[PDB]
Scaffold this active site. Sequence first.
Site, mmCIF file in Angstrom:
data_model
loop_
_atom_site.group_PDB
_atom_site.id
_atom_site.type_symbol
_atom_site.label_atom_id
_atom_site.label_comp_id
_atom_site.label_asym_id
_atom_site.label_seq_id
_atom_site.Cartn_x
_atom_site.Cartn_y
_atom_site.Cartn_z
ATOM 1 N N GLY A 1 0.775 -1.231 0.000
ATOM 2 C CA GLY A 1 0.000 0.000 0.000
ATOM 3 C C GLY A 1 0.819 1.301 0.000
ATOM 4 O O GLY A 1 0.897 2.032 -0.997
ATOM 5 N N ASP A 2 1.448 1.589 1.131
ATOM 6 C CA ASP A 2 2.232 2.800 1.274
ATOM 7 C C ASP A 2 3.730 2.553 1.061
ATOM 8 O O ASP A 2 4.536 3.468 1.169
ATOM 9 C CB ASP A 2 1.992 3.383 2.673
HETATM 10 MG MG MG Z 1 -0.566 2.516 -2.688
HETATM 11 MG MG MG Z 2 -1.839 5.526 3.279
HETATM 12 MG MG MG Z 3 -1.273 4.733 -0.234
#
Ligand code: MG
Ligand code: MG
Ligand code: MG
Lengths: 152, 152
Positions: free
Chosen positions: B18-19
């Site tokens: 995700g991040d």
């Molecule tokens: Mg992402």
């Molecule tokens: Mg995030």
């Molecule tokens: Mg993200």
Amino acid sequence: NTKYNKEFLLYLAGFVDGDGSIIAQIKPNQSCKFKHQLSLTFQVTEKTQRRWFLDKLVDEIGVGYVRDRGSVSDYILSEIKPLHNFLTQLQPFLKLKQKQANLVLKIIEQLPSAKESPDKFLEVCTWVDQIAALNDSKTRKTTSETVRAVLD
Amino acid sequence: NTKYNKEFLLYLAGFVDGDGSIIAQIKPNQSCKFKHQLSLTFQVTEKTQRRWFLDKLVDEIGVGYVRDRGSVSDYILSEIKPLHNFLTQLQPFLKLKQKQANLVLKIIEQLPSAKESPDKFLEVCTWVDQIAALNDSKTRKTTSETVRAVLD
DNA sequence: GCTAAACGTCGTGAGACAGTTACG
DNA sequence: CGTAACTGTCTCACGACGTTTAGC
Ligand SMILES: [Mg+2]
Ligand SMILES: [Mg+2]
Ligand SMILES: [Mg+2]
């Protein structure tokens, strides 16, 4: 009412804590008893080129849908019952959004009673307030405060 | 060589997808044999008001550090050994960044080789291109091509 | 009358390297 | 000298929303 694989939840809890969003919204609606409908949302956002991952979620969570909006796509889940079933199982694996998740469950359980007392409605509209507070909320316009204008 | 908790790895894999960012760079540098330093980086970016989650990661992974760049922060890990060790265990759970993860293990493993011939180095630089092409690369300057302009 | 699939978007919170240096 | 740390920052890729249409 399905139960999901544990490792599936661990991974997803992480993905959600990453690109996901647990939302509560007071939606002004002129047909509802109190001029607003409560709306709950579990969503994951990904660049459309990666739309397959979201399409897969539909299958795995077994409910919900994916929509398009430009260069980005979203997995969206708002159905109140499957949403509660899902969050209840995801909730214990979340780290950045465990609170909003439990606030959402809490809101759902207190839904029917929120239909009766106009004051019990406010209280629940408070729940949603807390949620936007926890998130990186910025473009929020309809709060429990504005529901105060439910005085006539 | 530290062993990681599988649940920690599953959750983290989700968070990374995700991040997170798995990056390989070809940094021009006039003190290296082929005038370019091969650099590897594993990172996770998160709003600074949430850096505790990154500090936590420093403690759990056992190596790496957190940097601040204004409104956001990054957990960073570039040391070759701990990196290869961490990616080997995390890689099996990645869904979106598995390939770049694996390309990094592959590059780190060909380091010495590539460190003894302008050709291996070239090929390895080609590994870096794939990683870049797998990510959402948007401001990349140096490529294997730019390195080939060493042939003289 | 309330759920809910659609549909439209502000302001970032991220991803992703660029570039240069201190030291083991 | 050779591998990582320190420092910069573009260009988004998402997050956390608002509003319209469907429909029993
Ligand atoms: Mg992402
Ligand atoms: Mg995030
Ligand atoms: Mg993200």
